[PDB]
């Protein structure tokens, strides 16, 4: 009987109580943090039931509670939020004035992380059957740390589970027997992380019977990583000793324990890498792969016919949904297509409520939604988080017994995404004028631009559609426009930064120039397609793949700059 049975009946209790469930949440919250001073700057006054809370607590954002969050991240260690101690800050891929959001967190919330994530084999072994009889070849990172002036950790959240108890000295678990050993995970290079971990799942290819990454870019990057250095991976195979390159002792030390020599595996893995075309080759190195686990929802969705290609139509799975503030659900039909997933939140992990999105208690709780309608999620946390709007739109497409499932919509705002990383307008616009400032010696200067998250390259990069308008009669050098490039992204927030310069989860950004009329013919070709001439502006981003072949074949001159932008860990105050 044993694990797998009783999971799922916990999902079917949990969602067939769910409206107690989430009282029982709430109740618990405000007892605990009765006394902490939000609530009672507030003078909720000890009350713990849903009507007052819904009355009296006001709707927030992150704005709201910064000043709070400063003073805890300050050292200030009353209880400001909550009533046990924050133990750390899960630092967002969410921004506020370019820098990360900082979500607080408690200890005991690991043990909410764990609950869901030993969820999602129960919920798979319905649909797949054997996977405690294999491994699952998963590329997964750690991140740069940090720390507040108080002394607390702020790091992302995977890098906060990976480094905790609940995953570092985790137990020998059959249906979640991965490649990777925790030394390669936890490795602070990230170029030995990448290399031991893609040595490892060659190592053991025939065992696996799923890959992926939490993100389609991480997976697609690995990917890449073994296109580049095949050689020196087989060579390591082939003679059975690591590469010196891998300095660090705890790897290698683990490495140690699976590398053999194997000329057959070498011959095997060159074989198939010196192929041209690598269309497949997921199900040539791993031929027991039985579907792709990565995140394919959202902006990630940009990434499926490239995952597409490398694995010969392989099912794309995306099992759960989650953020640093809070975990939220999992995907209760894994197997189902990437444009049909919806994800059950699981009532016990936070209080939730819904804003109502239109194309007096406004708010709407978990089992009041209704089929159909966009809300925007707002959470009440045990750390503290009291109806913080998280910024996801969600649209309710059904329910499991009685509690919802949603479709992911949307990050509001996004309008520029590789990896982690989130550019909105205003970035990106405040970006582009800080650039022209370099056209003016030549009294040039930009008529009109647009761009796209170009996936073409590994990593993915923005690209800038630049039409300029030209008065003098000096022709601009390569090393302007150069500078036009770094001068866009040093304007970009810190996660675009960081993905720059330290997790290398994105290229290097390109601005294209194309020539005169080009913008003209975006236009008269978006009319033929949406024919609303008084309401047309470039827009600011596209999409849309004959727009791009359109514009990339108007192409005069690319750019990109040979430098990095500045990047430093943490808050910039
Ligand atoms: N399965 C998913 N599909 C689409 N977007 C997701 C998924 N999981 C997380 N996200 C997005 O990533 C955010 C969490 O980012 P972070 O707070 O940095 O972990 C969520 O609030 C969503 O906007
Ligand atoms: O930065 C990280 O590695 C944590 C993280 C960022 N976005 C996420 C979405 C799903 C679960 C974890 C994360």
Redesign the pocket.
């Known amino acids: 009987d044993q694990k797998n049975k009783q999971k799922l009946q916990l999902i079917e209790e949990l969602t067939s109580n769910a409206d107690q469930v989430q009282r029982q949440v709430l109740e618990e919250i405000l007892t605990r943090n009765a006394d902490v001073e939000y609530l009672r700057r507030h003078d909720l006054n000890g009350r713990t039931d849903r009507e007052t809370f819904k009355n009296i607590m006001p709707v927030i954002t992150y704005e709201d509670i910064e000043p709070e969050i400063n003073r805890i991240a300050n050292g200030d260690k009353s209880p400001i939020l909550s009533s046990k101690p924050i133990s750390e800050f899960?630092?967002?891929?969410?921004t506020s004035g370019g820098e990360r959001?900082l979500?607080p967190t408690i200890e005991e919330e690991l043990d909410r992380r764990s609950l869901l994530y030993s969820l999602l084999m129960p919920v798979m072994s319905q649909f797949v059957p054997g996977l405690e009889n294999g491994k699952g070849m998963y590329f997964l990172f750690i991140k740069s740390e940090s720390k507040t002036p108080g002394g607390l950790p702020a790091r992302?959240?995977?890098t906060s589970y990976y480094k905790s108890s609940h995953f570092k000295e985790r137990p020998y678990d059959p249906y979640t027997n991965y490649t990777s050993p925790n030394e390669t995970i936890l490795c602070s290079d990230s170029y030995q992380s990448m290399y031991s971990q893609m040595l490892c799942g060659l190592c053991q290819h025939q065992e696996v019977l799923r890959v992926g990454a939490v993100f389609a870019s991480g997976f697609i990057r690995a990917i890449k990583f073994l296109e580049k250095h095949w050689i020196e991976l087989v060579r390591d195979i082939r003679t059975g000793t690591l590469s010196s390159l891998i300095t660090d002792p705890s790897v290698r030390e683990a490495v140690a324990k699976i590398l053999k020599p194997s000329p057959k595996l070498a011959d095997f893995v060159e074989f198939e890498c010196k192929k041209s075309s690598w269309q497949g080759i997921i199900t040539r190195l791993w031929p027991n792969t039985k579907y792709v686990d990565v995140?394919?929802?959202?902006?990630?969705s940009q990434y499926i016919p490239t995952l597409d290609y490398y694995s010969n139509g392989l099912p794309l799975v995306?099992?759960?949904?989650?953020?640093?503030?809070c975990y939220?659900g999992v995907?209760l039909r894994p197997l189902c297509k990437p444009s049909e997933?919806s994800?059950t939140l699981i009532p016990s992990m936070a209080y939730f409520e819904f804003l109502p999105v239109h194309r007096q208690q406004e708010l709407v709780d978990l089992v009041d939604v209704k089929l159909g309608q966009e809300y925007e999620?707002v959470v009440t946390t045990y750390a503290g988080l009291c109806r913080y709007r998280?910024?996801?739109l969600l649209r309710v497409t059904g329910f499991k017994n009685k509690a919802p499932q949603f479709s992911?919509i949307?990050?509001k705002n996004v309008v520029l995404s590789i990896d982690?990383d989130k550019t909105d307008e205003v970035e990106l616009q405040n970006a582009v004028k800080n650039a022209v400032t370099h056209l003016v010696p030549f009294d040039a200067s930009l008529s009109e631009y647009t761009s796209y998250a170009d996936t073409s390259s590994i990593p993915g990069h923005y690209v800038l559609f630049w039409e300029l308008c030209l008065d003098g009669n000096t022709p601009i050098p390569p090393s302007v426009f150069e500078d036009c490039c770094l001068a866009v992204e040093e304007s970009f927030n810190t996660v675009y930064r960081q993905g720059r310069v330290s997790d290398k989860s994105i290229g290097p950004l390109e601005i294209k120039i194309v020539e005169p009329g080009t913008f003209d013919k975006l236009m008269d070709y978006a009319i033929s397609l949406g024919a609303s001439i008084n309401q047309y502006k470039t827009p600011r981003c596209v999409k849309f793949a004959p727009i791009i072949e359109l514009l990339n074949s108007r192409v005069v001159d690319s750019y990109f700059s040979p430098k990095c932008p500045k990047w430093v860990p943490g808050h910039k105050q």
């Not at 899960?90 to 969410?94: A, D």
Request: proline share 3%; aromatic share 12%.
């Open positions: 899960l630092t967002s891929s969410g959001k979500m992302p959240v995977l995140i394919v929802t959202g902006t990630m995306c099992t759960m949904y989650a953020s640093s503030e939220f995907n997933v994800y999620l998280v910024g996801d992911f949307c990050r982690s």
